[PDB]
Design a protein around this ligand. Structure first.
Ligand SMILES: CCCCCCOC[C@H](COP(=O)(O)Oc1c(O)c(O)c(O)c(O)c1OC(=O)CCCCCC)OC(=O)CCCCC
Ligand SMILES: *[C@@H]1O[C@H](CO)[C@@H](O[C@@H]2O[C@H](CO)[C@@H](O[C@@H]3O[C@H](CO)[C@@H](O)[C@H](O)[C@@H]3O)[C@H](O)[C@H]2NC(C)=O)[C@H](O)[C@H]1NC(C)=O
Ligand SMILES: [Ca+2]
Lengths: 247, 420, 588, 40, 131, 49, 96
C-alpha cells in the first residue's frame, strides 16, 4: 500500500482485504511481506480503532486480530520495495522483512495506491515505473526466485504497470486500463474517508466464498469485476504463463 | 590624525552605542543576513560555555570560530560591545590611512607620467587631482562606518567585524610597504575566513610596485622578493595554526572551521548563493558543485592579476568584492568591506554604465531581506523561494556593480592612453 | 544615437505614461471582481476535501441551559464567572486551567474605560485519547465586560460535552473563554507560546496542549441566529490559509446555513448587473479592513503564531427564518471534525489572497499588478528625474529632520500625555491624540526654519535629488508593505503615489500643497474611515466623522502598544518622514 | 541502584571554569612581542 | 546527521514549587531529500526522561519478588522511604523551515545562471581589448 | 606599445580561461560525477556460461 | 546474471567489495570444476560453496539497486546550465 494520510484509507483497505483473503486461504505471516505506508487501522482519526472496514455495514474487519506489517510508515519506499523483490536488502534485514522465495515459489504481488500512466506514486513523493518493475521481475527470474508470479495492481491506469513485463511466468491483473483515471469517491458517513477501490472489493467478495480446498481457477477471477460493476475495465494479461489459466 | 575623521568616529560610535542599548539589538543579532554560522556572537558564547562544561567546542555542529577568537573573547567576554566598537574604529582608521597613502602614491605616479607625457592631449577632466582626493580617505572611513551594513554587523557582534579589521590592516600594511606585517595580517585573515588567500596576489604586486621591482619572468629580484613574502606568509599561517592547536591541544578547529567553510554542511540561509542551492541539490552530482563553487572564489585571482598587474589596489578591491559575493556563509558585513572602497573609485563616475539601477536593486534587496524573511519564517505567507529570489537579485546586483566599476576603470585607463 | 533616441521617446511620454500606469493599476484593482481573475474557491487540501463528516451534535438544549447559567453567574460575578466555568468544564470532563493576566494600558482608551486591565482566562483541554498531545485545536469565545457571548459560552460547553466521549481525536481541543475581548486572547496566546511580544504579565500556564494548528473564535450572543458571519482578517493584515475559509463555506453549504462575509451575500456573482458591484463592495470592505491591520476578532491574534484562525459571528437580524444552536453547533462540530483530519499543517491553498465574496478570490500573482502599476508610476518619475538630473549637503538638512520628525511622532504622543493633560483640559487619550496631530502639523508647517542655510541659488537640481530619494524610499517601502499586506500598500499607493509623482515648485505650488495634505497618511486614514462607513450604508457627517478620526488615531496607538500592530510605527516612522520629504520638495 | 545520587555526582570531574593553557598564552604573548621588535 | 544532543542533569527540586528548565534552540534547514513524506507535519522531539526517588507517604518494607505481586517488582527498591519513578514528558512537535520540494531543478539553473553572468561579465572584461 | 601590451595580456587571460576550463574543468566532471566501476572479469564470466 | 545486469545499465557503482567477491566466485568456480574432474570431491564441494557464497554476495549487494544513482539522460540536462558558461572558451579559442 503506497499511500499515507488517512484519506487514502481505501488503499490500506485494499491491501488488508487481499491480506485477509490470502491469510485465510493458507499463506503464513512469515511468507507475506505486507507493506502499509500508513496504519489508518488505529491512527487517532479512526472512529473505530484497530479496525479497517470494507463496507458501510462495518461487518467485515479486514484488519483482523491476526495481522503483521513487515514494512510500514516511512519504511514503505520504492527503494525498499525494489530491494525486497530483487533481494538487494541491507544484510541486517531479518527474515520476515524479505522475500526468501526459490525456484519452487509461487508469488502473489498486490500493489495499490495513486498510480498514473505506467507509474505508481509511493506516499505522494517518489515513483515506481513499469520499466523498473519489469526489470525487477526479470532480475527475480534470472535467479529463479519464483516459479509462477501473479501480479495484481489496483491503481488508476493500472493496465500499463504490467505492459513492460518479459520475465517467462507472470500473469497480471489490473483494476483499470491504460486510459480510464476517474477515481471513485463515496466516503462512508461513519468512517470519514472512502472504504475501497470497488475492484478489490469484488475480488474480496469473490475470495470470501472459497475455502482452502477450493478448485476455483484463474478463469473465474479474470471476470470477478464486470464493466457494469466497477466503472473501469479490469484487464488481465496472460502472454507469459505457460499453463492455461483455466487450470 | 585628522580633523573630521575624529568627528566621523564619534558619530559612528554614538550610533553604534545607541543601537547596542536600544531594543533592536536582539533583533539585529538574530538577523540571519548579518550573522552566519562562522560569525555569530551567540555561537562564540556557546563555545565558551562548552569549554566551561569541559566538552570541546568543536565536538558539535554549532561552533565554528577559530581558537584565536576563543582566546580573545575568553578575556573580552564582558566588554564585547566596546571591543566591537574598537575593532570597527580600527578598521576605519586603517582604511583612512591606507587610502591616504594610496592617493599620495597615485598622484605621484600621475605626476611622473605627465612629466614624460604618455597621455593624450584630450585629457583634462580625467586626471586625479589633489582637491578631489583630499576627502577620499575621509569618505572611505565614512562609508566603512556610517553605512547600515557595518552598523548591523557591529550591533550583531559578528566576528566578520574582526575579519574586516584584519583585512583592513593587511591593506594598510601592504600600502605602507611593511612586507612582514602584511604577511602577518594576511595570515591572520586567511586563518580566520580562509578567503583572503587570493589577496596574497594583489598585496605582493603592490609590494613589488612599491619596491620598483619589475614583475617579469627573467628578473631575479622579483623571484627573490616573491619567495621572501610567500615564506613570511606561509610561515605566519603555519605558526598561527600550530598555536591554535596548542590552545585546545587538538586539531579539531581545522575540520570544524575550514572544512565547514569549504564543504558547506549547514544550509542556514544567507545573502549568498550556497544555502538554497545546496539545500535543493541532488545527492550524487553535489560534490562537483561544491568543488566548482569553491573554485569560483579563487578562479579570477590569476586573470585579474594578469590584467591588473599595474593596478594592485583596484585588483585588491575587485578581489575583496569577489570574496564577499562568492563565499560560503557570507554576512552583509563582508559586503561593507568592499563597499567602503567605493569613494576610492568615485572618479570613475562618468564611465559607470548603470549605477542608478544597480544601487536601487541593492537597496531594495537589502530592505526586502528582513521583510521576506519575516514573511516565510514568522509569517507563513511566503516560502523559501521569495528569499532565494531576493538572494539571487542581491548577488546579481553585486556582480553587475563590480563589473561596472571594473569596466569603468578599464575605460578610464584606455582614455588615459587614447584620447576620448 | 540609440541612448538619446530612447531617452527622448521616454521623456516625450513622462506625464502620459505615468498617468496611464496609475489608471492601469486602478483598473486592474477594479477588475479583481470579475471571473477571469476571481475564478472560484476550492479545497486544495485532500486531507479534508476527500473526507466527509456526519455530524451528531444534538445538545442545543444543553447549550441553552449552559448559556443561562453563565449569564446568571456573570451577572453575579461582575467580570467573568471563574468558579462556575471551572465547575462546568470539569463536569464535561475537561482538564481545566485558569490564567490570571494584567496589563498597564498606555491611556484609558476612551472606549472601554479600562486603564489597569486585569482578568482571568479560563480554558479547558480536551485530551486526545489516542494521540500523545502534540497538536491541538482551539475553540475560543472572547467574552467581554458586557452581556454578549453568553450563548457562545453555552455552545462551547455543549460542544466540549459532545467532543469529550469521542475516540477519534488526533489533536487536543482547547476550549478557551477569555476575560476581555482581545487582551485576554493576547495574554493567553503569549503565555501559551511563553513569549512576551506585547509586554503583558500573566501567571504561568499549568497546562498546554501542544502546537496549535487551527483556531475558531465563536462569537454568539443570541439563541437563534439568522446568518453566520465569518471574519478572516488578522493583525497586521495577515490572513488564515484559504482552506479554512473553504472548509467553513462547504460546511455552511452542507448544513444549509446562510453564511456571509462581512455581512454581504452573493448567490452567484454571475448576475452581470449587480454581482460585480457586490463583489467590488465586499472586496473594498476587505481591503479597508486589512489595511486597518487590527485584530477584528480573536482570530486575528492567532495568525501571528502561524495558527490558521477564523471568527464566526452569529448575527440575529430581522429575517424570520432562524437557525438554532444545532445548525451552528453542527457546523462547528463538522469544522472541528474535518480539521482533525488535517494530519499536516495547512501548506496548500493560498496565504496571500484578496477575496471578493467568500467563494471567489484572487491570488497574489493576480492582484499584484494593482499595486505594481502604482509603484511603476514612482519608478518612471524616479527614472526621468534621474535622467533630467544628469542630462549634496542640501539633502542632509531635510532628510534628518524628516526622520527626526518621524521619531518625534512615534514616541512623544504617548509619553507626553501627562504633561499634555497637566497643560490642557483634555483626557489622557485625547492628550495622546492631540499630541500626535500637533506633531503632525508641526512637521507640516516647518519648511522655513530648516532653510536657514543657502548653499545654492535658484537650485532646481538639489531639489531633484531630494525628490529622487523620496520617490525611491516611497516606492521601496510601499512595495514592502504590499508584500506584507497588500491592502495597506494599495490604499497608500492610490493616494500618495499620484501626489508624490507631481510635487515640483514650478506648478501652482498651492494646489500641490492641498493635494499632498489631502493625500497625507492621516488624510488617507480619514478618507478611508469615510469610505468604510459609506460602504456599510451608514453615511457619517463631518462632526462624528472627525470624532471617528480621533477614535481611530487613539485605537491605532493603543493597538500598536497592546498587540504590536505594525501600523502606528509604519505610518509614523517610515511613511511620515517620506511624505515630509515630498513636502520639502514642494517648498524648496 | 536506580538513582545513585551520591555516586553520579562524583562520577564526573569537578566543573571548573576553563582557561587557556599556559603554553598558548606564553607562546602567543612571546610572538606578539617578537613582531613588535622586527618592526621596531 | 550522526549524533543527537544529549543533556543529563541532576536538578534538586526544592519544595512545593515549579522548576522551569529551558534551553534555546535554533531550527535547522535540511536538504530537500531529508524531510519525511509529510514534511509540513513537523519533526518529533523525543519525550524527556525524568528519573526520581519520590518520597513515600508511608515507608515500604523489603519484600521478595516472588511473594510480591507482579506490579510491585518492576523496580529494584533501594531506600524504602523513597520509591523510584521514571516519568516521560510529551513528545514535542517542532516544525522546521522547509525548502520548496517542487523546484530542485530550477534552483540549479538559476544559481548557475548567476555564476554564469559573473563569468561572462569577467570574461568580457579580462579578455576584450578596448577599441 | 601599450595597445600591444594590453592585447597580449587579454590573450593571456583568455588562454588561462581555456586552460583551466579544460585541464581542471573536465577532470572535475570526470572524477566527481562518474559512477565508480571496478574491474570485473567479463571474459571468464562469459566462459563460465 | 550479474554481468548482464552491469552491461545493461551503465550507472551502477560496482565497488571493490563486489569486484573482490566476483573474482573470488570466478576463481572458486574454476577451481571446483577442475577438482570435480579428479579424486577431489571434498575440495570441489568446498570450492563450490565458496563460489556460491561469493557470487550471491556480489549479486545481492545493497549497492546494485539502480535507484541510488542519477539517471544518465538527465545528467546531460543538468549540465547545460554549465554549458552556457563553458561554451564561450571553446568557441573563442577557435574564432581567434
Ligand atoms: C531571479 C528572480 C526570481 C527567481 C524565481 C521566482 O520564482 C520563485 C518564487 C515562487 O514563490 P512560491 O513558493 O509562492 O510558488 C510556488 C509554490 O508555492 C509551489 O508549491 C510550487 O510547487 C511552485 O512551483 C511555485 O512556483 C515556482 O516554482 C516558481 C517558477 C519560476 C521559475 C523561473 C525559471 O517567486 C517569488 O515569489 C519571488 C518574486 C521574484 C522577484 C522579487
Ligand atoms: C513581559 O515584560 C513585562 C515588562 O516589559 C513584564 O511586566 C513586569 O511584570 C512584573 C511582575 O512579574 C512587574 O513587577 C511587579 O511590580 C510591582 C510594582 O512595582 C511589584 O509590587 C510586584 O511585586 C512585581 O515586582 C513589573 O512592574 C512589570 N513591568 C512593567 C514594565 O510593567 C511581564 O511580566 C513580562 N511577561 C511575563 C509573562 O512575565
Ligand atoms: Ca510477514
Amino acid at each position: 500500500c503506497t499511500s499515507r494520510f488517512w484519506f487514502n484509507y481505501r488503499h490500506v483497505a485494499n491491501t488488508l482485504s487481499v491480506y485477509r483473503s490470502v491469510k485465510r486461504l493458507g499463506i503464513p505471516d512469515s511468507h507475506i511481506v505486507l507493506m502499509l505506508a500508513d496504519d489508518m487501522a488505529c491512527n487517532p482519526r479512526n472512529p473505530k480503532p484497530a479496525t479497517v472496514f470494507s463496507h458501510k455495514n462495518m461487518e467485515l474487519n479486514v484488519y483482523g486480530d491476526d495481522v503483521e506489517v513487515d514494512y510500514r510508515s516511512y519504511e514503505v519506499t520504492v527503494e525498499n520495495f525494489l530491494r525486497v523483490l530483487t533481494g538487494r536488502i541491507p544484510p541486517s534485514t531479518p527474515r520476515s522483512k524479505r522475500l526468501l522465495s526459490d525456484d519452487r515459489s509461487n508469488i502473489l504481488i498486490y500493489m495499490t495506491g495513486h498510480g498514473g500512466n505506467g507509474f505508481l506514486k509511493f506516499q505522494d513523493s517518489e515513483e515506481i515505473t513499469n520499466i523498473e518493475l519489469a526489470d525487477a521481475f526479470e532480475q527475480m527470474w534470472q535467479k529463479r526466485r519464483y516459479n509462477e508470479l501473479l501480479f495484481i495492481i489496483d491503481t488508476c491506469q493500472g493496465a500499463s504497470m504490467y505492459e513492460r513485463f518479459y520475465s517467462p511466468n507472470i500473469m497480471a491483473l489490473a483494476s483499470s486500463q491504460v486510459g480510464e483515471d476517474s477515481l471513485s469517491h463515496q466516503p462512508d458517513p461513519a468512517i470519514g474517508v472512502h472504504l475501497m477501490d470497488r475492484y478489490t472489493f469484488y475480488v474480496l467478495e469473490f475470495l470470501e466464498e472459497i475455502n482452502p480446498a477450493s478448485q476455483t481457477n484463474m478463469n473465474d477471477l479474470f471476470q470477478v469485476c464486470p464493466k457494469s460493476l466497477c466503472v473501469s475495465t479490469p484487464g488481465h494479461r496472460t502472454d507469459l504463463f505457460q499453463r492455461d489459466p483455466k487450470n | 590624525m585628522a580633523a573630521p575623521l575624529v568627528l566621523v568616529l564619534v558619530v559612528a560610535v554614538t550610533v553604534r552605542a545607541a543601537l547596542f542599548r536600544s531594543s533592536l539589538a536582539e533583533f539585529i543579532s538574530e538577523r540571519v543576513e548579518v550573522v552566519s554560522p562562522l560569525s555569530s556572537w551567540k555561537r562564540v558564547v556557546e563555545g565558551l560555555s562548552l569549554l566551561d562544561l569541559g566538552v570541546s567546542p568543536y565536538s558539535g555542529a554549532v561552533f565554528h570560530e577559530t581558537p584565536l577568537i576563543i582566546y580573545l573573547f575568553h578575556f573580552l567576554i564582558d566588554y564585547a560591545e566596546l571591543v566591537f566598537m574598537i575593532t570597527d574604529a580600527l578598521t576605519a582608521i586603517a582604511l583612512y590611512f591606507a587610502i591616504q597613502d594610496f592617493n599620495k602614491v597615485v598622484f605621484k605616479k600621475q605626476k611622473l607620467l605627465l612629466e614624460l607625457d604618455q597621455y593624450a592631449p584630450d585629457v583634462a577632466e580625467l586626471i586625479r587631482t589633489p582637491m578631489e582626493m583630499r576627502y577620499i580617505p575621509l569618505k572611505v572611513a565614512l562609508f566603512y562606518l556610517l553605512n547600515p551594513y557595518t552598523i548591523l554587523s557591529c550591533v550583531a557582534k559578528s566576528t566578520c567585524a574582526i575579519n574586516n579589521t584584519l583585512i583592513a590592516f593587511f591593506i594598510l600594511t601592504t600600502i605602507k610597504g611593511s612586507a612582514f606585517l602584511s604577511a602577518i595580517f594576511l595570515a591572520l585573515a586567511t586563518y580566520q575566513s580562509l578567503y583572503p588567500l587570493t589577496l596574497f596576489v594583489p598585496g605582493l604586486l603592490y609590494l613589488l610596485q612599491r619596491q620598483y621591482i619589475p614583475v617579469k619572468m627573467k628578473s631575479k629580484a622579483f623571484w627573490i622578493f616573491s619567495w621572501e613574502y610567500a615564506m613570511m606568509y606561509v610561515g605566519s599561517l603555519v605558526v598561527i595554526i600550530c598555536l591554535s592547536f596548542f590552545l585546545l591541544s587538538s586539531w579539531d578547529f581545522i575540520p570544524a572551521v575550514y572544512g565547514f567553510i569549504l564543504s558547506v554542511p549547514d544550509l542556514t540561509p544567507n545573502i549568498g548563493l550556497f544555502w538554497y542551492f545546496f539545500a535543493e541539490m541532488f545527492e550524487h552530482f553535489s560534490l562537483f558543485f561544491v568543488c566548482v563553487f569553491q573554485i569560483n572564489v579563487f578562479f579570477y585571482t590569476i586573470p585579474l592579476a594578469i590584467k591588473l598587474k599595474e593596478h594592485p589596489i583596484f585588483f585588491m578591491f575587485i578581489q575583496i568584492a569577489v570574496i564577499a559575493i562568492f563565499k560560503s556563509y557570507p554576512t552583509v558585513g563582508d559586503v561593507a568591506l568592499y563597499m567602503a572602497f567605493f569613494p576610492v573609485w568615485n572618479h570613475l563616475y562618468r564611465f559607470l554604465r548603470n549605477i542608478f539601477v544597480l544601487t536601487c536593486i541593492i537597496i531594495v534587496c537589502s530592505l526586502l531581506f528582513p521583510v521576506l524573511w519575516h514573511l516565510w519564517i514568522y509569517a507563513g505567507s511566503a516560502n523559501s523561494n521569495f528569499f532565494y529570489a531576493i538572494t539571487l537579485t542581491f548577488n546579481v546586483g553585486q556582480i553587475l556593480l563590480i563589473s561596472d566599476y571594473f569596466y569603468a576603470f578599464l575605460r578610464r585607463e584606455y582614455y588615459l592612453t587614447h584620447g576620448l | 544615437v540609440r541612448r538619446r533616441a530612447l531617452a527622448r521617446l521616454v521623456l516625450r511620454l513622462n506625464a502620459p505614461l505615468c498617468v496611464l500606469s496609475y489608471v492601469a493599476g486602478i483598473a486592474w484593482f477594479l477588475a479583481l471582481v470579475f471571473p477571469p481573475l476571481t475564478q472560484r474557491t476550492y479545497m486544495s487540501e485532500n486531507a479534508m476535501g476527500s473526507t466527509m463528516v456526519e455530524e451528531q451534535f444534538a445538545g442545543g438544549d444543553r447549550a441553552r441551559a449552559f448559556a443561562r447559567d453563565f449569564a446568571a453567574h456573570r451577572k453575579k460575578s461582575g467580570a467573568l464567572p471563574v468558579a462556575w466555568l471551572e465547575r462546568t468544564m470539569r463536569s464535561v470532563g475537561l482538564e481545566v486551567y485558569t490564567q490570571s493576566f494584567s496589563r498597564k494600558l498606555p491611556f484609558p482608551d476612551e472606549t472601554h474605560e479600562r486603564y489597569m486591565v486585569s482578568g482571568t482566562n479560563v480554558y479547558g483541554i480536551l485530551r486526545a485519547p489516542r494521540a500523545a498531545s502534540t497538536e491541538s485545536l482551539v475553540l475560543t469565545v472572547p467574552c467581554g465586560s458586557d452581556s454578549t457571548n453568553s450563548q457562545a459560552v453555552g455552545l462551547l460547553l455543549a460542544l466540549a460535552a459532545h467532543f469529550r466521549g469521542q475516540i477519534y481525536w488526533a489533536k487536543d481541543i482547547v476550549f478557551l473563554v477569555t476575560e476581555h475581548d482581545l487582551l485576554g486572547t493576547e495574554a493567553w496566546l503569549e503565555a501559551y507560546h511563553d513569549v512576551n511580544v506585547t509586554g503583558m504579565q500573566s501567571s504561568p500556564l499549568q497546562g498546554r496542549a501542544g502546537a496549535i494548528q487551527a483556531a475558531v473564535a465563536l462569537e454568539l450572543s443570541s439563541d437563534v441566529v439568522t446568518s453566520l458571519d465569518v471574519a478572516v482578517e488578522g493583525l497586521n493584515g495577515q490572513l488564515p490559509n484559504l482552506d479554512l475559509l473553504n472548509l467553513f463555506q462547504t460546511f455552511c453549504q452542507k448544513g444549509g446555513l446562510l453564511c456571509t462575509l462581512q455581512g454581504k451575500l452573493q448567490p452567484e456573482d454571475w448576475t452581470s448587473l449587480d454581482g460585480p458591484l457586490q463583489g467590488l463592495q465586499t472586496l473594498l470592505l476587505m481591503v479597508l479592513r486589512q489595511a486597518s491591520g487590527r485584530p477584528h476578532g480573536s482570530h486575528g491574534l492567532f495568525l501571528r503564531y502561524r495558527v490558521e484562525a477564523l471568527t464566526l459571528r452569529g448575527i440575529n437580524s430581522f429575517r424570520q427564518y432562524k437557525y438554532d444552536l444545532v445548525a451552528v453547533g453542527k457546523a462547528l462540530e463538522g469544522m472541528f471534525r474535518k480539521l482533525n483530519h488535517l494530519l499536516e499543517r495547512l501548506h496548500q491553498s493560498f496565504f496571500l489572497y484578496l477575496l471578493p465574496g467568500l467563494s471567489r478570490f484572487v491570488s497574489i500573482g493576480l492582484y499584484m499588478p494593482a499595486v505594481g502599476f502604482l509603484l511603476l508610476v514612482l519608478g518612471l518619475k524616479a527614472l526621468e528625474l534621474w535622467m533630467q538630473l544628469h542630462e549634496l549637503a542640501s539633502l542632509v538638512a531635510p532628510l534628518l529632520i524628516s526622520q527626526a520628525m518621524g521619531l518625534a511622532l512615534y514616541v512623544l504622543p504617548v509619553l507626553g500625555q501627562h504633561v499634555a493633560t497637566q497643560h490642557f483640559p483634555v483626557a489622557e487619550a485625547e492628550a495622546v491624540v492631540l499630541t500626535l496631530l500637533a506633531i503632525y502639523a508641526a512637521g507640516l508647517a516647518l519648511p522655513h526654519n530648516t532653510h536657514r542655510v543657502v548653499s545654492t541659488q535658484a537650485p532646481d537640481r538639489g531639489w531633484m535629488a531630494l525628490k529622487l530619494v523620496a520617490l525611491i524610499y516611497l516606492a521601496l517601502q510601499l512595495g514592502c508593505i504590499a508584500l506584507t499586506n497588500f491592502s495597506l500598500g494599495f490604499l497608500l499607493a492610490t493616494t500618495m503615489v499620484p501626489t508624490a509623482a507631481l510635487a515640483k515648485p514650478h506648478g501652482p505650488r498651492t494646489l500641490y500643497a492641498a493635494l499632498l495634505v489631502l493625500t497625507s497618511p492621516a488624510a488617507t486614514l480619514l478618507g478611508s474611515l469615510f469610505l468604510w462607513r459609506e460602504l456599510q450604508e451608514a453615511p457619517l457627517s463631518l462632526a462624528e466623522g472627525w470624532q471617528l478620526f480621533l477614535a481611530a488615531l487613539a485605537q491605532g496607538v493603543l493597538e500598536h502598544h497592546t498587540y504590536g500592530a505594525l501600523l502606528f510605527p509604519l505610518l509614523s516612522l517610515g511613511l511620515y518622514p517620506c511624505w515630509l520629504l515630498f513636502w520639502n520638495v514642494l517648498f524648496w | 541502584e536506580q538513582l545513585p545520587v551520591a555516586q553520579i555526582i562524583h562520577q564526573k570531574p569537578k566543573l571548573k571554569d576553563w582557561h587557556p593553557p599556559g603554553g598558548f598564552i606564553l607562546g602567543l604573548w612571546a610572538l606578539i612581542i617578537m613582531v613588535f621588535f622586527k618592526t621596531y | 546527521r550522526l549524533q543527537p544532543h544529549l543533556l543529563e542533569m541532576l536538578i534538586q527540586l526544592p519544595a512545593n514549587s515549579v522548576t522551569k528548565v529551558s534551553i534555546q534552540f535554533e531550527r535547522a534547514l535540511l536538504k530537500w531529500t531529508e524531510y519525511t513524506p509529510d514534511p509540513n507535519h513537523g519533526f518529533y522531539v523525543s519525550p524527556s526522561v525524568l528519573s526520581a526517588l519520590v518520597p513515600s507517604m508511608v515507608a515500604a518494607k523489603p519484600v521478595d519478588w516472588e511473594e510480591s505481586p507482579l506490579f510491585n517488582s518492576l523496580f529494584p527498591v533501594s531506600d524504602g522511604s523513597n520509591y523510584f519513578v521514571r516519568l516521560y514528558t510529551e513528545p514535542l512537535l517542532v516544525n522546521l523551515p522547509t525548502p520548496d520540494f517542487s523546484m530542485p531543478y530550477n534552483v540549479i539553473c538559476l544559481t548557475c545562471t548567476v555564476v554564469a553572468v559573473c563569468y561572462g561579465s569577467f570574461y568580457n572584461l579580462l579578455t576584450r581589448t578596448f577599441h | 606599445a601599450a595597445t600591444h601590451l594590453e592585447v597580449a595580456r587579454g590573450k593571456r587571460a583568455a588562454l588561462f580561461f581555456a586552460a583551466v576550463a579544460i585541464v581542471l574543468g573536465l577532470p572535475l566532471w570526470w572524477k566527481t560525477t562518474e559512477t565508480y566501476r571496478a574491474s570485473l572479469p567479463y571474459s571468464q564470466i562469459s566462459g563460465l556460461n | 546474471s550479474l554481468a548482464q545486469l552491469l552491461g545493461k545499465i551503465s550507472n551502477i557503482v560496482i565497488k571493490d567489495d563486489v569486484a573482490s567477491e566476483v573474482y573470488k566466485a570466478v576463481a572458486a568456480v574454476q577451481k571446483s570444476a577442475e577438482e570435480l574432474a579428479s579424486a577431489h570431491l571434498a575440495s570441489a564441494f568446498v570450492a563450490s560453496q565458496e563460489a556460491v557464497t561469493s557470487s550471491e554476495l556480489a549479486f545481492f549487494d545493497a549497492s546494485l539497486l539502480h535507484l541510488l544513482y542519477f539517471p544518465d539522460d538527465q545528467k546531460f540536462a543538468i549540465y547545460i546550465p554549465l554549458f552556457l558558461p563553458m561554451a564561450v572558451p571553446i568557441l573563442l579559442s577557435l574564432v581567434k
